Symmetry: D2
């Protein structure tokens, strides 16, 4: 799979488990079209979102439902969700890992792109 998502919890120092993730692809009319979704596993990872054939160049949005995650833990969060928007390119063969670190009032996201 060319696309992977990894989510970490900065408060408990653990993978963020069972977090909902929705991926969208930008359509010709500039609206967001559902592309793939899933929930993070006990490793805080989400594999098998898509394949090489379907993952063509374009603009993608990864939406992480952080609000429901903090609500489950009884912690009041600031953000409705975390959004990561990027362009996928074919500048050679590549695997994309979208990593996110979550706190109730802060989040960080990083792209790890390897060949």
């Amino acid at each position: 799979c060319p696309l992977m998502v990894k989510v970490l919890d900065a408060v408990r120092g653990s993978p963020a488990i069972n977090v909902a993730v929705h991926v969208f692809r930008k359509a010709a009319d500039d609206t967001w079209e559902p592309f793939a979704s899933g929930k993070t596993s006990e490793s805080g990872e989400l594999h098998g979102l898509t394949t090489e054939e379907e993952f063509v160049e374009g603009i993608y949005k990864v939406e992480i439902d952080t609000k429901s995650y903090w609500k489950a833990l009884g912690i009041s969060p600031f953000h409705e969700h975390a959004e990561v928007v990027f362009t996928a390119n074919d500048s050679g063969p590549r695997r994309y890992t979208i990593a996110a670190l979550l706190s109730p009032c802060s989040y960080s996201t990083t792209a790890v792109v390897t060949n």
Copy 2:
């Protein structure tokens, strides 16, 4: 001002200057309505986006145009922009500082909220 945005550059270790910021509010019909916009100053801060009167309860989106910022420095970054989505003033009026820390392939954002 109830809403302030502060942007830093993690590569140069300086404020991020002349960064475009657009703010939207979710309308009754569920679409994003333009709320305000501006550019960061020499100190990486954006003040005067709105007033107490105008800044009513609702869901807001702060979009920071990170791509244009990195491209003007010769760097092709990963993200199209950084988006911060939150509910504001749902327990009464508050002052919000949205801070963002930028790297070409990573960003973090934090909220500082005071009564």
Copy 3:
């Protein structure tokens, strides 16, 4: 003041108040000599640590006592403290802002340096 420290809390989305900060300078004999210390104020800032005259070239260490901060909130954190080590004024005098963002199992620190 040439040296300023700013500390934020990622869990509460507020400045980190009453956090102890100790600053050390590397001496000729390679040991850490106490340089200054203080606690953050209501705004999470620590000013007046030193003056231009006293803040000469050298390697400095800023130690932020994060453990005591989290323990006073009922949280047992991961780190003993956050340490920031840097060479200062090796290309002439500068003004340094050391910012830190705290979570129980994570922290980030950034430097803002201006001429």
Copy 4:
């Protein structure tokens, strides 16, 4: 191995490869005693630092030579190194992953502790 280190590069959006890492254990006299060292691999990971038998409760310091890393890339960095200091506990069986995200003027570190 109960202790692992993972290092990421926020500028290039890749693992930080061939980064030197030194681990120390706090001795009864409060000095830092060398414990283990190595260089990160092509995955930005460092495995096999120690074993269950030798990794007893105590205070450990992980030092990441970030300065040499940025120097190799021709980017001027702020910090001499990144330091992570923590207490290892036997609160049940556990594996520790110390993750770090690097920019020239900023770094973040997180502990991912799983069972």
